[PDB]
């Protein structure tokens, strides 16, 4: 995961030569300078008469990116006749396969062809060129008197290569014996020492080779791919030979004893043409010192969720056991045609964590199929099948795509840090890329608190700025900078300690540190060598009990870590990274003993009582009601303390009053659950003994209907505690009452009348308004001002009429509205006024005989106006006095009322009574 | 009166067609900014716009030709018909659609396009001789399956490269069999000889004209040949309107992807056609073999069934390859290949369980959504096909033809055809966004009552 793709060392050669077919790394005992090897099969060179011979070029990884040919030769074809190749170095693909060890480089030409003096037939024997220091040797055991396809003529030695521990050379020759194949193996030392340039059929004394097989194995290609390892227990490494068309095109991998070409182990593919054996690699994946064998099968067809066959490529993993009984897992490509089995190669210990591992190439994957290489760690039980990181080609196809990862090598520490890189070929782009690894540090961090249980009275720490002491605790932070390979001895770790993380986000800060007087502290820690778990200690301050009501909620202490980079990096800028599976979030929880007596059992004494601010609710409107609820804690404290009150829906809860500083500010919810109506206040979950919380609960009581004489609220306080969870219930009632003030109003339309009315004359029997006099409309009204409606009232009117024997006001019509019905004792409109189209001074009802008019008034809503209008005429005869001039008069009527019945039958009811005088000034 | 386009289409002569199929636009001053505009056809019609100035296209689904579907392939004279609608008239307005359906029957008669791809290795010289009676006889037996069958021919001899070919170690192998007192051909990879033709007697002659070549490496180049025969529609003569039967005739195991490494062939096979003007696969020396994955994808995508006419001794590999190349079939070939006629007739009968549609020459602006009736009256959305049918069974596809935006005023022909079948539905599609109202406009300052503006499509602007 530590392999970057940001600053790779990018290698390339001349276009069309296919640089990238095979890669390797050269590390001679001769120097501190190492070189990358990249093969280029179609390369042109100096050798006269030879085209597309191929070449392997050596490149200095420290900048200096120029690649240069290895001088394995310079001459043209070995002759026999002049200018007649005895060997054809043209179109041979040199660099198709490249491998080295120490100061020896052996490059392959699988299409190297020979002429045998015996018969004029060109044969695809395949050979290698060995560069030993400055000495050059032709390696070709595949060339012998066995001139054709029946023989070794078709070996095509060179498709696969490796070396054993010490010095044996493994040359795969898949075309041998009618393409059954053959693995050719010899000590490189014998090859160098016994070589005679005038003989092209040199046999070696220690030469081993797979024997010719039955026709059963025709076209199997043993030698397509090869690897080495300690498969047959200890001793010399064995040979891992891929044979992709063995087992009827399923493919097989054979492991041959390194000392004798006789099969030890046999592995096979599950699917036809998967090509099980394209890539055979071996490594000790579990870190238990035994090589396993990982077999790529790039054409493997998997099955998707829809049953579709998906060409993804497979890597078949055979995990070694002492008994030779291999266990197995499978890795597979993700994308279609992203041939994942194309290459497997050692990465070595990518994190320096004790596990050897590999990387997998899927050369034709990615949108814009550049090729993807999958990097993951080994495990004691197998491979981590899921990539942590991938390397990807950065180049577009010129024609064919680069096929990134087609060829691959690794498990070499090229730079100063002992974290191996990956050399990933890209032959379709004439390129190879070195992806560098960062150091990987596993950091074991720990956080401990000694007095994990707190006591608020243990005030033993001095606070630096006061004469006062503090109850406190010791927080310890340790660090282990573990890492292998080469990493700087001293690592720089940045650590921050956060106290009370869960309360800082808007709640009261329960705890701070003594010296910084804040909930946080940080330091840059220098941790050296690994295992040196040095530490720092901080002392925390528990906040004063007089302000902080919290007793049960834990105090959490957190460590937050960052591994630095510039200050922990080497001279090439190769910064470390922490191990991908290591957390940087470490914590401990501390708690305070919540009272709980001497026996550590919480035994609360929960009690509640209330104070009513208002004693009455009036019926018919929304009556505010605030009740102060007092929550006591007379015993031990409590867990998840709450105030619960059962409230009739008719009493609409508004909230907890925040307009009085003498009261606690309690959060409060309103809900209905399982046929209930409730108000719930937050008394503080972690409650302490002695806490007194008072709060006002404000309601709006509607109750407009014919309800009970009081509104009842049922209150209790409770907890989730082990003992005594609920307080006794306090039952609170607020009286309900009928309030129905009614205002009696009235007015005479005109306030006054002037006697000299134009054309106003006396008639023995008057008709129409003109012969009677002015019309005055007297308005009487009952208005419901109070909130309570009523069912019945009466409006009583006394209309002055006969002063002495003079009839003054004749009622034309009673215009009434609302639920009103008038009954009169005396005849109304005795004068037959068909008009429509609408004690001397005070002519009161106690002076002039009055008419008694009583109006029944029915049900009236609050705010309703019950109206009585009396339209009447002033008759001339009774105003135009005859006895002595005239007098100013006040014509005075009187309207009284009495509200009798309310629908609120079960409530106290008071009669509502009053009266208004209505007058006209006649002058 | 006022209905949608009353406020959304009055400002535009075209938008009103785009907004609703029920709206109409008067012209020639029928209602010269009278009061209502656009509304519905009927509202303007009543308010003095009854004459055809209303220019009222609506979306329409009509059938131009519906010759009935046939029961038997033997029902000659009137053309045996495999599908029900033949020609359809579709009129769309912007952002709208119309429904139609395609009834297809597996009549005992859909057409067959068969390609005879032969192994031209030396052991087959006697097969080329036996095959001189085929084409004519193959088609004759097939006449009972369908009245219309075409036969082509090609061959394979493997990649002409160093390790597969006898390497041209000498010159002697540039024109081989000098070794045994005879002569034979050089290696060529994949060759195409005869495109499919109804004149099947041409095959008899074309095979007589052929002769074998020499292969050192026993595995055949059959997978390149199959993939090219599968992919190169333009030369093989595949009519989309016909079933494609690729017959692979051989006496040996095939060469597969990444085996090509032995010749220096490492180039991935992209599944593309590489057959040039010489009817030859030019990629035979640079490209690797296709994988089972590529074969499956291309033959499935393009509706090619493979028939493996393979001799008994190598059947195990071909049957196992078929399991990883779904949709294909493998039979057993006689050493004298005299049973190809029966092998194919049987293979065809075994293949016959699918109906799938393809729409040719569809423009980017129109989307055809399918719901396929695979069983009884149940339809599965997103399908152009149904599986599990027998000869004589039918399938019914429900299709929605929707247009996005307002494509140019050109008639397009959408050909909806079963793959496999001659008969197809030609849907002729036009777009009613552009109509007479646009031409019928004379702004001229005045005409917008007392003012200075424009006037179009029955409304001043």
């Amino acid at each position, epitope marked *: 995961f530590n392999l970057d793709v940001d600053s790779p060392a990018e290698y390339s050669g001349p276009e069309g030569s296919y640089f990238g077919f095979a890669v390797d790394f050269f590390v001679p005992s001769a120097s501190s300078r190492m070189f990358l090897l990249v093969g280029a099969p179609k390369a042109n060179t100096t050798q006269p008469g030879i085209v597309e011979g191929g070449q392997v070029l050596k490149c200095d990884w420290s900048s200096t990116r120029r690649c240069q040919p290895i001088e394995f030769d310079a001459t043209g074809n070995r002759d*026999y*006749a*002049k*200018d*007649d*190749p005895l060997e054809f170095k043209s179109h041979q693909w040199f660099g198709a396969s490249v491998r080295s060890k120490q100061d020896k480089i052996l490059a392959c030409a699988p299409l190297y062809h020979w002429r045998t*003096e*015996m*018969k*004029q*037939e060109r044969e695809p024997v395949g050979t290698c060129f060995l560069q030993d220091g400055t000495k050059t040797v032709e390696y070709a055991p595949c060339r012998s008197q066995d001139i054709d396809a029946d023989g070794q003529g078709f070996c095509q030695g060179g498709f696969s290569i490796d070396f054993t521990k010490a010095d044996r050379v493994l040359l795969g020759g898949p075309g041998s014996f009618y393409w059954q194949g053959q693995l050719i193996s010899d000590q490189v030392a014998e090859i160098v020492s016994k070589y005679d340039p005038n003989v092209y059929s040199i046999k070696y004394n220690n030469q081993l080779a797979t024997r010719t097989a039955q026709a059963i194995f025709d076209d199997s290609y043993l030698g397509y791919s090869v690897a080495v390892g300690d498969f047959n227990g200890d001793g010399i490494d064995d040979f891992v030979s891929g044979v992709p068309r063995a087992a009827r095109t399923l493919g097989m991998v054979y492991i041959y004893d390194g000392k004798n070409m006789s099969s030890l182990y046999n592995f096979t593919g599950e699917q036809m043409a998967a090509y099980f054996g394209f890539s055979v690699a071996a490594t000790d994946i579990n870190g238990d010192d035994y090589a396993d064998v990982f077999i790529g099968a790039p054409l493997f067809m998997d099955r998707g969720s829809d049953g579709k066959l998906q060409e993804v490529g497979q890597v078949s993993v055979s995990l070694q056991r002492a008994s030779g009984d291999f266990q197995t897992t499978k890795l597979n490509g993700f994308e279609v045609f992203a041939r994942f089995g194309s290459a497997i190669a050692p990465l070595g210990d990518l994190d320096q964590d004790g596990f050897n591992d590999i990387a997998i190439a899927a050369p034709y994957g990615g949108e814009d199929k550049k090729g993807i290489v999958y990097i993951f760690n080994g495990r004691s039980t197998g491979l981590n099948a899921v990539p942590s990181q991938i390397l990807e080609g950065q180049w577009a196809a010129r024609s064919m795509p680069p096929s990134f990862g087609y060829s691959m090598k690794g498990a070499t520490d090229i730079d100063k840090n002992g974290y191996p890189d990956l050399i990933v070929g890209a032959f379709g782009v004439d390129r190879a890329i070195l992806y560098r690894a960062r150091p990987v540090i596993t950091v074991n961090a720990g956080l401990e608190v000694y007095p994990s249980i707190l006591n608020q009275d243990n005030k033993t720490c001095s606070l630096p700025g006061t004469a006062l002491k503090v109850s406190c605790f010791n927080v310890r932070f340790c660090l282990k900078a573990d890492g292998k390979g080469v990493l700087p001895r001293k690592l720089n770790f940045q650590v921050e300690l956060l106290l009370d993380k869960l309360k800082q986000k808007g709640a009261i800060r329960r705890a701070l540190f003594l010296y910084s007087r804040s909930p946080s502290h940080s330091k840059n820690m220098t941790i050296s060598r690994g295992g040196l778990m040095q530490c720092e200690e901080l002392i925390a301050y528990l906040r004063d009990e007089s302000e902080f009501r919290d007793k049960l909620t834990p105090i959490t202490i957190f460590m937050e870590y960052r591994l630095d980079y510039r200050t922990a990096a080497d001279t090439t800028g190769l910064q470390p990274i922490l191990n991908q599976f290591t957390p940087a979030n470490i914590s401990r929880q501390a708690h305070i003993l919540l009272d709980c007596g001497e026996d550590n059992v919480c035994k609360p004494k929960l009690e509640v009582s209330v104070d009513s601010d208002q004693k009455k609710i009036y019926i018919g409107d929304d009556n505010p009601l605030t009740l102060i609820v007092k929550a006591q804690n007379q015993g031990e404290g409590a867990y998840e303390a709450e105030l619960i009150v059962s409230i009739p829906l008719q009493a609409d809860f508004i909230g907890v009053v925040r307009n009085n500083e003498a009261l606690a500010r309690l959060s409060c919810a309103f809900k209905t659950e399982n046929q209930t109506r409730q108000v719930v206040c937050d008394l503080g979950n972690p409650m302490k003994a002695g806490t007194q919380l008072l709060a006002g609960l404000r309601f709006s009581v509607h109750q407009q209907s014919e309800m009970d004489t009081s509104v009842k609220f049922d209150l209790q306080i409770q907890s989730s505690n082990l003992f005594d969870k609920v307080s006794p219930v306090v039952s609170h009632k607020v009286d309900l009452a009928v309030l129905a003030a009614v205002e009696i109003r009235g007015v005479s339309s005109p306030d006054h009348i002037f006697l000299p009315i134009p054309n106003w004359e006396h008639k023995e029997n008057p008709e129409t308004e003109e012969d009677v006099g002015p019309v005055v409309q007297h308005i009487y009204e009952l208005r419901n001002n109070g909130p309570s409606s009523f069912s019945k009232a009466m409006l009583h009117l006394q209309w002055p009429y006969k002063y002495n024997n003079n009839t003054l006001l004749y009622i034309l019509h009673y215009d009434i509205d609302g639920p009103m019905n008038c009954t009169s004792d005396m005849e109304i409109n005795p004068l037959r006024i068909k008009i429509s189209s609408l004690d001397i001074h005070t002519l009161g009802c106690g002076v002039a005989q009055c008419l008694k008019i009583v109006c029944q008034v029915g049900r009236l809503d609050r705010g309703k106006s019950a109206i009585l209008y009396v339209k009447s005429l002033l008759w001339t005869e009774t105003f135009m006095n005859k006895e002595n001039q005239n007098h100013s008069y006040s014509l005075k009527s009187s309207a009284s009322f009495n509200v009798i019945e309310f629908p609120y039958k079960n409530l106290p009811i008071e009669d509502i009574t009053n009266s208004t005088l209505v007058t006209t000034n006649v002058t | 009166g006022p209905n949608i386009c009353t406020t959304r289409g009055v400002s535009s002569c075209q938008q009103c067609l785009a907004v609703s199929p029920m709206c109409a636009w008067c012209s020639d001053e029928a209602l010269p900014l009278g009061s209502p505009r656009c509304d519905l056809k009927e509202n303007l019609l009543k308010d003095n716009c009854a004459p055809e100035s209303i220019e009222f296209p609506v979306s329409e689904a009509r059938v131009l030709e519906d010759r009935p579907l046939s029961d038997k392939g033997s029902g000659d004279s009137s053309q045996v018909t495999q599908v029900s609608p033949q020609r359809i008239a579709l009129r769309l307005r912007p952002d709208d659609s119309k429904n139609f359906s395609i009834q297809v029957r597996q009549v005992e008669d859909y057409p067959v396009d068969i390609y005879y791809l032969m192994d031209l290795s030396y052991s087959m010289k006697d097969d080329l001789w036996s095959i001189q009676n085929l084409g004519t006889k193959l088609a004759t037996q097939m006449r009972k399956l369908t009245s219309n069958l075409r036969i082509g021919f090609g061959a394979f001899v493997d990649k002409p490269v160093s390790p597969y070919m006898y390497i*041209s*170690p*000498p*010159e*002697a*192998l*540039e*024109n081989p069999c*000098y*070794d*045994m*007192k005879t*002569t034979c051909l*050089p290696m060529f990879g994949y060759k195409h000889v005869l495109t499919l033709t109804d004149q099947v007697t041409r095959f008899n002659e074309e095979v007589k004209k052929q002769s074998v070549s020499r292969n050192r490496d026993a595995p055949e180049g059959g997978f390149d040949a199959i993939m090219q025969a599968t992919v190169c529609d333009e030369k093989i003569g595949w009519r989309n309107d016909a079933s494609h039967l690729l017959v692979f005739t051989t006496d040996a195991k095939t060469h597969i992807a990444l085996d090509g490494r032995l010749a220096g062939i490492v180039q991935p096979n992209d599944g593309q056609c590489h057959v040039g003007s010489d009817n030859h696969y030019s990629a035979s020396t640079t490209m690797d073999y296709p994988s089972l994955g590529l074969m499956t994808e291309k033959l499935s995508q393009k509706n090619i069934n493979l028939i493996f006419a393979v001799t008994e001794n190598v059947v195990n590999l071909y049957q196992n390859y078929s399991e990883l190349i779904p949709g294909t079939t493998v039979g057993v070939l006689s050493m004298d290949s005299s049973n190809v006629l029966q092998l194919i007739v049987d293979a065809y009968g075994k293949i016959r369980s699918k109906v799938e549609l393809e729409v040719r020459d569809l423009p980017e602006e129109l989307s055809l959504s399918f719901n396929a009736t695979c069983l009884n009256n149940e339809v599965i959305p997103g399908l152009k096909s149904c599986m599990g049918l027998k000869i004589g069974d039918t399938v019914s596809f429900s299709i929605e033809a929707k247009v996005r935006g307002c494509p140019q005023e050109k008639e397009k022909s959408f050909t909806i055809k079963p793959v496999g079948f001659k008969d197809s539905l030609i849907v002729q599609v036009t777009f009613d966004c552009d109509c007479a109202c646009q031409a019928q406009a004379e702004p001229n300052s005045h005409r917008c009552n007392n003012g200075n503006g424009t006037f179009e499509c029955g409304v001043c602007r």
Partner: antibody
Amino acid sequence: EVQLEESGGGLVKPGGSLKLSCAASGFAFSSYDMSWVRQIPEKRLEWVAKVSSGGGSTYYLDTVQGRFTISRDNAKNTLYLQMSSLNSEDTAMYYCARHNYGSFAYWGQGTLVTVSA
Amino acid sequence: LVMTQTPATLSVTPGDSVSLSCRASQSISNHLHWYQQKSHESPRLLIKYASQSISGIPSRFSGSGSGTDFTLSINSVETEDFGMYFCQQSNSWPHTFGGGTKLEIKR
């Protein structure tokens, strides 16, 4: 070193018969094809007949076929050519030769055959 | 098939260079060999397969060509190069030889 030696040439009356032989050594005789080439008095070389390494396939010049037989004994390392119904056209120096894939890599010294009355 | 070989005769002074030309009536790919024959001696293979020399044949002798037209070039002709030259076709039965070229040394 390859050694080829022809013998048995001489004067044959027209319509007669004659057997030529050619001994061989210095090589794996049974691993190579063999042929006879004759040099016509006009100094023109003409290929006459070829026999495959195992003796299985034998090819003859069209104007020779039906009259001559080419054969070999791979145990005795000796090549033979049995001529019959000889005409004047058959007078020539006959040479045995070893093949290298269509070329005549090695030749004998030649045995002269005269057809005349 | 007919193999035409020209020139029939050639007179070359030592140190000068020459060439011979082989014409086939049809294409014979690279199935063309060249031989030399000195007085009272048998023919010897010079060049095989149109351009591949043999084992002890001088570089001075160089074959070239394909299909229908082949050559044999001899650089810096030596006295010892005197003698007949023949081309031979190995493509199709019967094998055929060219008429042959008689190389003479000019003195």
